[PDB]
Ligand binder design. Structure first.
Ligand SMILES: Cc1cc2nc3c(=O)[nH]c(=O)nc-3n(C[C@H](O)[C@H](O)[C@H](O)COP(=O)(O)OP(=O)(O)OC[C@H]3O[C@@H](n4cnc5c(N)ncnc54)[C@H](O)[C@@H]3O)c2cc1C
Ligand SMILES: [Cl-]
Length: 487
């Protein structure tokens, strides 16, 4: 008979899941599996991101229980757990969504070898990306496009991405009873307390497919907003209602299908003819993701400077003091420190807020490597994605895809244009809550009498600027200009 495993790694969803539909097909028993390494901590990851994963698994659990089945969270490494359960469960087919990340390729190969030894058929559909990213490279003549203009041209030549896959059946073949490796007490979803985390998650975005589809429908409640979306014109200071979709954590874990999102965009575009076009449109934002997945998956050492054929070799400074101040939100520049606090508190910041902090640490003020910034973002972002985090840090550091190092964001003026009263700053830096708006972006300029009334004396309650932006940016630009002459 047919006994199948659907292995979740990403794709933590039941919609547009071609691997689950194939697994459930003609199956006597389907085994829904997530593999959790119980020592991933003891070895880098925030409770905000890890708990979002756990909430995503608890949603999957509820969804499978509704359909007569059960999510099995196996503890161990895939290479050691799958050979046993292949034979324990009499598995004939193993299904999972294809992953193009470097560690994914090594892991999936070894598992595919194990499945062959056990007589197990492997089916690996593509669904995390709009397209088969290797088909895009082959249609482009064997190399990934290196500009979005050429990439947008390529996808339009290829045509619409595949349609979202149908929904799974209302009743699923369950695991077989009294299998020892599927015992309930060994296969449940743990809490954040039981994985070793001692401080609670604080983010306001809840994990799971059910919340991802609720947040999708919220975005599409105003079609005219979807149609006219222009990414560079949105507001980074907006926190009560963020100015973009905040679907990124759900797309990263696959709680939301990229293809379903794309299909819903085109239906709105069909009825709104003046709709915005790539790159600034919402569809364009999914294409930024695909562009970076396509380049990054075909580029060696993509997450690194050294050995990376697309990254400029820049002489960044090893300055732990500047880095530490940036990471711990104590630069003395409230726009920067507020954004870095939202990072550690919510794990999500608007795209231009990320611009402001990434420029500051790299080609604008502190001249620290974008790798040191990417590592900090990897720990705290709930949307952390190998290829998107790496390419946007190379972009922001003018090390790849971007070359206009004379455009330096001001850590004082940038946010002021959107939020003159500093509502964003007061929310995330309550120490400045009583600071008059005239000084809230430059508190070191306030007379001492003003500092004492507001309760924020610089050097006592809030740090002093670690640099003079005018001096620092002028130095950093000079150095960047000599490097671009050096290459
Ligand atoms: C230094 C830096 C690091 C970043 N690291 C990440 C990361 O780890 N994970 C991540 O998802 N994005 C990352 N981004 C890209 C971008 O800032 C986020 O995708 C965006 O802020 C998510 O908000 P949203 O879902 O509201 O996006 P929307 O504007 O609503 O866009 C919809 C979707 O398009 C995709 N998208 C949007 N902007 C980009 C972009 N610039 N590059 C690639 N895909 C994009 C995302 O999947 C996003 O959810 C980074 C950007 C910078 C400057
Ligand atoms: Cl500016």
């Amino acid at each position: 008979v047919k006994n199948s495993i659907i292995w979740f790694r990403k794709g933590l969803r039941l919609h547009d899941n071609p691997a689950l539909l194939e697994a459930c097909k003609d199956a006597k028993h389907v085994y829904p599996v997530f593999v959790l390494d119980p020592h991933f901590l003891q070895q880098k990851v925030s409770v905000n991101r890890y708990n979002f994963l756990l909430e995503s698994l608890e949603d999957l659990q509820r969804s499978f229980q509704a359909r007569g089945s059960r999510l099995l969270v196996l503890r161990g490494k895939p290479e050691e757990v799958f050979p046993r359960v292949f034979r324990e469960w009499g598995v004939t087919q193993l299904c999972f969504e294809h992953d193009t990340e470097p560690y994914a390729k090594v892991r999936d190969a070894a598992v595919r070898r194990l499945a062959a030894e056990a007589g197990v058929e492997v089916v690996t559909p593509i669904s995390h990306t709009l397209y088969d990213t290797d088909m895009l490279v082959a249609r482009n003549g064997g190399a990934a496009p290196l500009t979005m203009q050429s990439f947008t041209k390529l996808v339009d030549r290829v045509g619409d991405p595949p349609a979202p896959a149908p929904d799974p059946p209302a009743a699923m073949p369950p695991p077989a009873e009294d299998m020892p490796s599927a015992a309930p007490a060994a296969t449940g979803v743990p809490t954040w307390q039981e994985v070793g985390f001692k401080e609670p998650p604080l983010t306001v975005f809840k994990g799971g497919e059910t919340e991802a589809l609720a947040r999708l429908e919220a975005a599409f409640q105003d079609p005219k907003w979807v149609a006219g979306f222009q990414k560079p014109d949105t507001d980074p200071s907006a926190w009560e209602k963020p100015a973009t979709t905040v679907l990124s954590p759900y797309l990263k874990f696959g709680c939301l299908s990229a293809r379903l999102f794309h299909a819903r965009l085109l239906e709105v575009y069909r009825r709104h003819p003046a709709h915005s076009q790539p790159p600034v449109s919402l569809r364009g934002q999914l294409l930024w993701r695909e562009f970076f997945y396509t380049v990054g998956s075909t580029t060696p050492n993509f997450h690194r400077m050294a050995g990376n054929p697309v990254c400029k070799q820049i002489d960044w400074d090893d300055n732990p003091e500047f880095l530490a101040a940036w990471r711990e939100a104590r630069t003395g520049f409230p726009w920067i420190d507020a954004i870095m606090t939202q990072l550690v508190t919510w794990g999500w910041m608007h795209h231009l807020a990320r611009h402001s902090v990434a420029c500051f640490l790299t080609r604008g003020d502190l001249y620290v490597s974008w790798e040191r910034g990417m590592e900090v973002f990897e720990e705290h972002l709930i949307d952390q994605d190998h290829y998107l985090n790496a390419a946007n840090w190379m972009w922001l550091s003018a090390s790849a895809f971007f070359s206009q190092y004379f455009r330096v964001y001001s850590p004082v003026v940038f946010g002021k244009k959107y939020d003159p009263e500093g509502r964003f700053i007061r929310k995330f830096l309550p120490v400045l809550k009583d600071m008059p708006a005239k000084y809230i972006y430059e508190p070191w300029t306030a007379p001492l009498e003003v500092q004492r009334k507001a309760g924020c004396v610089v050097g006592r309650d809030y740090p002093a600027p670690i640099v003079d932006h005018a001096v620092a940016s002028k130095a950093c630009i000079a150095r960047m200009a000599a490097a671009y002459r050096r290459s």
